Amino acid sequence: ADALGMIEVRGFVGMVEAADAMVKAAKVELIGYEKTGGGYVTAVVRGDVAAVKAATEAGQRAAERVGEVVAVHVIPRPHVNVDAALPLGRTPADALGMIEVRGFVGMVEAADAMVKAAKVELIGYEKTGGGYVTAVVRGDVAAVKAATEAGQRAAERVGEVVAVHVIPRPHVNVDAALPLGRTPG
Amino acid sequence: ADALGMIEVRGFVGMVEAADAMVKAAKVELIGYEKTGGGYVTAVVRGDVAAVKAATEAGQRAAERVGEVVAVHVIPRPHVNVDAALPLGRTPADALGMIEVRGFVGMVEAADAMVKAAKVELIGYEKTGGGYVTAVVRGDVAAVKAATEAGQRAAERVGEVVAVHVIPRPHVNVDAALPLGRTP
Amino acid sequence: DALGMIEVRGFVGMVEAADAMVKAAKVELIGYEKTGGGYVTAVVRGDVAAVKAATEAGQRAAERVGEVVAVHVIPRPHVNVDAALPLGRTPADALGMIEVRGFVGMVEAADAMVKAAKVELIGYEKTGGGYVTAVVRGDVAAVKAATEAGQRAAERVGEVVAVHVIPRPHVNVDAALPLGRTP
Amino acid sequence: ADALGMIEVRGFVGMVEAADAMVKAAKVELIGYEKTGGGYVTAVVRGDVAAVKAATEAGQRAAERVGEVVAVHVIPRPHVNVDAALPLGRTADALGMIEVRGFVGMVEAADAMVKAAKVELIGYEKTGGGYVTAVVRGDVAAVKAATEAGQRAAERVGEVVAVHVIPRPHVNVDAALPLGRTP
Amino acid sequence: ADALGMIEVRGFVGMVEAADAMVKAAKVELIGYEKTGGGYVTAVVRGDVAAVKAATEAGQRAAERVGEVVAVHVIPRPHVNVDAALPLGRTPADALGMIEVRGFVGMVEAADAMVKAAKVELIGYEKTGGGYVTAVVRGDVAAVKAATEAGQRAAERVGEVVAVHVIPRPHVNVDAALPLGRTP
């Protein structure tokens, strides 16, 4: 049985940055993310007990710079009954810009100001519940930086901005399990 | 030509951690490292203006956690005379465990405690200058994580420990440009 | 392409700003705009990353000589902006400069420069509001001693604004700016 | 046996200026330099007791204007055992130098020098202890303004140690020091 | 595997005195010395766990008289991986006078005054980095004593004197592992 690592963040942006820091620290597989509602989302990774332990710590320190970290824990050897009843994966590049706003109106204005500021592509939006919505844009590292900065400013005068972050080079394992507009397929 | 990125740290451990965080943060190429003596080393990355500047900000925050950073700067378009006269690369995986001590005695005791803790391989030692030496060990993440914690506790009772860090999966560009015992 | 602008109330501060931009990154100086009253604006264009790195590099060098008014970068300008505004996208000898808010003080400045060493007075630039700039060219040794002697002789006459010397101006500066070395 | 004169400086720039002022003062031969590490370098000259004593005093007065002068001593008649066990030599274009205790500060200084004027960066010298020195050559005027611009850009990066320019270095300096003009 | 004994001293004079006291106290072998730069040098001896411990304490006791004793440690049973990657000696008489100066100019004046004071022979000089240089002379204990005391008084007028020591009868093992002009 592979190890289990989880990071829960009240915010879709903080969970993505946490997932990006975990797959870059050690060799762990990002099986996906669990949405419990009310903005709470949980990134789930699996691998070796030491690789998960190191990635769990590295992801928490990187996620504290963007969003609210709720719980962070590592299970060395999860029971077989846990993997059977819970969606934990083992049940038998382009730059990234993100803006999370507690309000659908504030997220639309943030996305409208991003595609007009620089050469970026709005791949869509993510609903984490509780009124939290996240605009996801992809493009060049110089473009999404100038886009999110212009989008965050234009959105602070409309709604309640939760988190704004830019990932210059997201890992290949992140774009495979997370809906970030670059899923190969 | 390409852009230029440099991070100088008075410590071989803080430079490797900075170089590892840069090649992972953006699309940059680590051409190598420069030793100016007295414990000073400088990691040199190159790429485009946007990626080098975005990788340099990530390498600084990761280096300040371990080593004593000295200088952090980016040059957008270096002159042709600079690339020709300076070694900047444009002249026409196992786990990583490192312990740095300003003293040869403290480094040997730390290296002896690392190989005795778990199954790790002592690839050798790096002499930074000015009494600075760094013991480098490789192996699996389970053994390297426990070897350094046993080596640091046994090295502080001997000499002056500078920095102790562990990299679970170092980037392929790091093992290719730095003498970390895994160069093909 | 991106857009970069630096506005300085002084023709000398704009040339040093434009010279520092094309040397720092890979951008093209499309020209300059004179809005009158001594206000001039250097306009460069390129990619989003290079324009940002060059705009601040030119601002840091322009603050040493002249009064910087505004500095801004537009990442992706709308196509209607480039069609109605002169922003470039529309469908070497040394440099010695002395700017004076007075025509009398500028003539004495230019007279003392050509007498100190062997330089060529290519002409003068009128930026409006009483601001005039004397431009001399030559080797680095001459324009260094010419401007220093011309600065001391001009302060005793008029209101000196700025004095600066660029040893090797970039090839893009002499192409877009009237500095007597246009191919 | 010949006489002996030495000047030790914690700075490669201060040692070169000390060596230049010595061979220009009296009839002495610069036999080379010794690097002891940690930024300490020593200039060694040989000649007659009259020439080595006037050059040593003339090199100390000029070396104090740039870097830290560690020791200065003259030996009139060294023992034969000293010349047998110690490397004491017994058995032009302008010069611009910028020394920084940090490799990053030296690169930014070297980049700003070749961008400011038409000077050639011949390379860099590593004296140990983190001390590195960028060496550029050219004419007396451009290398003067290049080092001034390279020093201004390096202060906002690292620790600048010494900055100096030599108009016409002696032929004995270029023959014993790796300054890019060695025959 | 033989025992490991190391004594690190920021000064070449203190390292030679510590090495001379180790081979005379117990039955150990001096494999050599390690130079890490910045004036730091490490004397490495090897023998049994008891002889190394007794000689190491005797070396530190004599090294505290001249120079900075940085680190002192004894590894009883060193791992075979340490001896493979580190130069620790296990891999597959006339009087002595020394004057250490943090300055090349003061070291030359000290060496010149020594050979002129008494009948001694200047064998050479050792560079330990960081500006530290050590002049070494050999001869009779009467002449070496009179030479070092005259060279120190002349060297203090020039540079920074670090340490001055005289060994009347250095052990034969010291002259074989250290560059002191009397190597067979």
From Swiss-Prot, chain D:
Applied uses, from the record: Artificial BMCs can be made in E.coli by expressing (Hoch_5815, Hoch_5812, Hoch_3341, Hoch_5816, Hoch_4425, Hoch_4426, Hoch_5814) or (BMC-H (Hoch_5815), BMC-P (Hoch_5814), and 3 BMC-T (Hoch_5812, Hoch_5816, Hoch_3341)). Cargo proteins can be targeted to this BMC. Artificial BMCs can be made by duplicating this gene with a 16 residue linker between the copies (making an artificial BMC-T). The shell assembles into balls with holes where the pentameric subunit would be, and can be used as a model to study assembly and permeability.
What is one cellular component GO term in this UniProt entry? bacterial microcompartment
Keyword annotations: Bacterial microcompartment
- Where does the protein end up? Bacterial microcompartment
The BMC domain is annotated at 3-178
What Pfam family does this protein match (any one)?
BMC
What is the documented disruption phenotype for this protein? Absolutely required for BMC formation; when deleted from an artificial operon (Hoch_5815, Hoch_5812, Hoch_3341, Hoch_5816, Hoch_4425, Hoch_4426, Hoch_5814) being expressed in E.coli, no BMC shells are made.
Q: How does it assemble?
A: Homohexamer with a small central pore. When purified protein is examined by atomic force microscopy it dynamically makes uniform patches about 35 Angstroms thick with hexamers in the same orientation. In the BMC the concave side faces outward, with the N- and C-terminii exposed to the cytoplasm.
Cited function? The only hexameric shell protein in this bacterium, it forms the majority of the bacterial microcompartment (BMC) shell. Expression of 5 proteins in E.coli (BMC-H (Hoch_5815), BMC-P (Hoch_5814), and 3 BMC-T (Hoch_5812, Hoch_5816, Hoch_3341)) forms a 40 nm artificial BMC with a molecular mass of 6.5 MDa. There are 60 BMC-H hexamers per BMC. The shell facets are 20-30 Angstroms thick (a single hexamer layer), with 1 of BMC-T trimers protruding to the exterior.
The record's similarity note reads: Belongs to the bacterial microcompartments protein family.
Q: What is this protein called?
A: Bacterial microcompartment protein homohexamer
Origin species, per record, is Haliangium ochraceum (strain DSM 14365 / JCM 11303 / SMP-2)
